[PDB]
Amino acid sequence: LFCKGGSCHFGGCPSHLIKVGSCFGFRSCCAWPWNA
Numbered sequence: 001l002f003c004k005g006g007s008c009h010f011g012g013c014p015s016h017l018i019k020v021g022s023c024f025g026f027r028s029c030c031a032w033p034w035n036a
Helices: none
Strands: 006-010 018-022 027-031
16 A cells, blocks of 8 residues: 555554555555655
8 A cells, every 4th residue: 555655554664664644544654754
């Protein structure tokens, strides 16, 4: 599941990414830090 900036991951976000918001349900939406 993509996320405005990156991708969604259940649990949280890869150290690289930034939590943009919630993903489908219990999942977390992650985007890239460039501006997050």
